Design a protein around this motif. Sequence first.
Motif, mmCIF file in Angstrom:
data_model
loop_
_atom_site.group_PDB
_atom_site.id
_atom_site.type_symbol
_atom_site.label_atom_id
_atom_site.label_comp_id
_atom_site.label_asym_id
_atom_site.label_seq_id
_atom_site.Cartn_x
_atom_site.Cartn_y
_atom_site.Cartn_z
ATOM 1 N N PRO A 261 -13.542 35.999 -36.091
ATOM 2 C CA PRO A 261 -14.591 36.984 -36.785
ATOM 3 C C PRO A 261 -14.006 37.084 -38.081
ATOM 4 O O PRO A 261 -13.071 36.639 -38.643
ATOM 5 N N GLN A 262 -14.870 38.307 -38.800
ATOM 6 C CA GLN A 262 -14.447 38.575 -39.989
ATOM 7 C C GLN A 262 -12.659 38.884 -40.323
ATOM 8 O O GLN A 262 -12.296 38.061 -40.908
ATOM 9 N N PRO B 25 -7.953 42.461 -31.164
ATOM 10 C CA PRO B 25 -8.690 43.258 -30.454
ATOM 11 C C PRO B 25 -8.669 43.039 -28.788
ATOM 12 O O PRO B 25 -8.385 43.623 -27.916
ATOM 13 N N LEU B 26 -9.133 41.700 -28.534
ATOM 14 C CA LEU B 26 -9.233 40.847 -27.307
ATOM 15 C C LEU B 26 -8.079 41.391 -26.599
ATOM 16 O O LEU B 26 -8.020 41.732 -25.630
ATOM 17 N N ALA C 189 -7.156 45.146 -25.977
ATOM 18 C CA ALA C 189 -7.952 45.665 -25.121
ATOM 19 C C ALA C 189 -7.502 45.047 -23.443
ATOM 20 O O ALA C 189 -7.381 45.944 -22.666
ATOM 21 N N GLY C 190 -7.197 43.878 -23.493
ATOM 22 C CA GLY C 190 -6.445 43.487 -22.154
ATOM 23 C C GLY C 190 -5.337 44.320 -21.679
ATOM 24 O O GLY C 190 -5.353 44.807 -20.672
ATOM 25 N N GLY D 32 -6.357 48.050 -20.961
ATOM 26 C CA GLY D 32 -7.024 48.185 -19.667
ATOM 27 C C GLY D 32 -6.159 48.029 -18.555
ATOM 28 O O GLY D 32 -6.379 49.019 -17.646
#
Lengths: 44, 44
Positions: B4-5, B10-11, B14-15, B18
């Motif tokens: 992305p930009q 992030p991916l 977050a993993g 979580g």
Amino acid sequence: STLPQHARTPLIAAGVIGGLFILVIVGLTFAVYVRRKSIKKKRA
Amino acid sequence: STLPQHARTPLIAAGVIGGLFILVIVGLTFAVYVRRKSIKKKRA
């Protein structure tokens, strides 16, 4: 400001996946570790 | 395929988040639920 190419919902997705997957291993690991103790234990 | 930009990580982030967070609640919930059973039970 702007958005990427086609970012559906990777962030959130990975979140729910991580919690589930991680729980899958831990959970099973517990049920498995315990089972290892149960092996036709006779008690009269 | 592409990125992305300007998404650092992030991916993956977050993993790990979580699994940890989710585990924190579940884990504590267990240690807490059990404690609720132990209420200064005297046994001589």
